[PDB]
């Protein structure tokens, strides 16, 4: 069904499906079983920042995740996105909880995409930046349990009145406008995304994670993708 390319900030190690034995960042190409992962020293209750970059010349998707006053974690994977995704896609953020839980709060999100053609000065670009989310954010498609406006933040998964995260929750937010990632005369296509998040859990074992993803424009949450599937995949294959 959906074609998904995602960078996961996986908080819970599901060693039975290929996760390493610790929280990690990974690059998922059409499967929850990451093509590449890196140990991530996740900090419960602290605001982190993720940066994702890619360009069609190098064909390498890279991500860096950091917390203030700490060393960052980085993961890269050689992949030609032209061979994986359609030329028009939507970009978004996804998150889930299962038996274990955590808040999956997004405080800001920016994205820039550029397509430079062989025509002199021919540059097509799209850029958006959210540092504040309102209750009625018309330029975002919210799916599942995702809501905006609470403290000006985007809550990807269910959080009750008292601020407590709920289990078995899944939610995604996609930018309204389709994004053009390939064009026949483009000499270089590139994108960069940045988002800050706050993962907090009253438990010693938070779950399940947050993911930045790129999909077919009509992507929807697959049935039963709560928990380990991050609201992105229908199964663990």
Binding stretches for a second copy (CB under 8 A): 47, 49, 51, 53, 55, 57-58, 60, 62, 64, 66-70, 72, 74, 76, 88, 108, 116-132, 134, 136, 138-139, 152, 175-180, 183, 185, 187-188, 190, 194, 196, 217
DSSP letter string, 178-207: -EE---TTEEEEEEEEEEEEEEE-SSSS--
The verdict on whether omega for the bond into residue 208 sits within 30 degrees of 0, i.e. cis, is yes
Q: Is the CB of 77 or the CB of 213 nearer to a second copy?
A: 77
Contacts of 164 (CB under 8 A, 6+ apart): 202
CB of 45 to a second copy, least distance (A): 14
Q: Give CA–CA dist 179/30, Å, rounded.
A: 19
Q: Give the up-direction half-sphere exposure of residue 63: CA atoms within 13 A in the CB hemisphere.
A: 27
CB contact set of 126 (below 8 Å; sequence gap of 6+): 111, 112, 113, 177, 179, 180
Q: With respect to Ca ion, which residue has the nearer C-beta, 12 or 175? A: 12
Q: Tell me how far, at minimum, the Cβ of 30 lies from a second copy, in Å.
A: 22
**Residue 228, both tokens:** 């380990």
Partner whose binding site includes residue 216, from Zn ion, Ca ion, a second copy, none (CB under 5 to 8 Å by kind): none
Please give the size of the binding site for Zn ion, defined by CB under 5 A.
3
Shortest Cβ distance from residue 85 to a second copy (Å)?
14
The residue from 6, 19, 98, 215 that contacts Zn ion (CB under 5 A) is 19
Instruction: For residues 98 and 235, give the distance between their C-alpha atoms in angstroms, rounded to a whole number.
Output: 14
In whole angstroms, the minimum distance from the beta carbon of 38 to a second copy comes to: 12
- Tell me the HSE value of 214 on the side-chain side, using a 13 A CA sphere: 26
Q: Does 28 bind Zn ion (CB under 5 A)?
A: no
What tokens does 27 get? 């690059």
Cβ atoms of 6 and 232 within 8 Å: the answer is: yes
Residues within window 10-29 making contact with Ca ion, judged by CB under 5 A: 10, 12, 14, 19
Q: Is 158 annotated as a binding residue?
A: no
Question: From Ca ion, a second copy, Zn ion, none, which one binds at residue 62 (CB under 5 to 8 Å depending on kind)?
Answer: a second copy
Distance CA 168, CA 226 (A): 6
Name the residue nearer to a second copy (CB basis): 57 or 161. Answer: 57
172 annotated ligand-binding residue: no
Of Ca ion, Zn ion, a second copy, none, which one sits near residue 84, judging by CB under 5 to 8 A according to partner kind? none
Question: Contact positions toward Ca ion, by CB under 5 A?
Answer: 10, 12, 14, 19
Q: Which residues are annotated as a binding site for a carbohydrate?
A: 208, 228
């Amino acid at each position: 069904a959906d074609t998904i390319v995602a960078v996961e900030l996986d908080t819970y190690p599901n060693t039975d499906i290929g996760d390493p034995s610790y929280p990690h960042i990974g690059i998922d190409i059409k499967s929850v079983r990451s093509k590449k992962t890196a140990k991530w020293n996740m900090q419960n209750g602290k605001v982190g920042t993720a940066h994702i970059i890619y360009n069609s010349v190098d064909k390498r998707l890279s991500a860096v995740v950091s917390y203030p006053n700490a060393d960052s974690a980085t993961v890269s994977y050689d992949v030609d996105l032209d061979n994986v995704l359609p030329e028009w896609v939507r970009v978004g953020l996804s998150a889930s909880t299962g038996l274990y839980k955590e808040t999956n709060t997004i405080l800001s999100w920016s994205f820039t995409s550029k397509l430079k053609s062989n025509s002199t000065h021919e540059t097509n670009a799209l850029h958006f930046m959210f540092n504040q989310f309102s209750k009625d954010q018309k330029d975002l498609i919210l799916q599942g349990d995702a809501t905006t406006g609470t403290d000006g933040n985007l809550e990807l998964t269910r959080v009750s009145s008292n601020g407590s995260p709920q289990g078995s929750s899944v939610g995604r937010a996609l930018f309204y406008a389709p994004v053009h990632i390939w064009e026949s005369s483009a000499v270089v296509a590139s994108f960069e995304a940045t988002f800050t998040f706050l993962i907090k859990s009253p438990d010693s074992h938070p779950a399940d994670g947050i993911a930045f993803f790129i999909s077919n424009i009509d992507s929807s949450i697959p049935s039963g993708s709560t928990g380990r599937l991050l609201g992105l995949f229908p199964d663990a294959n």
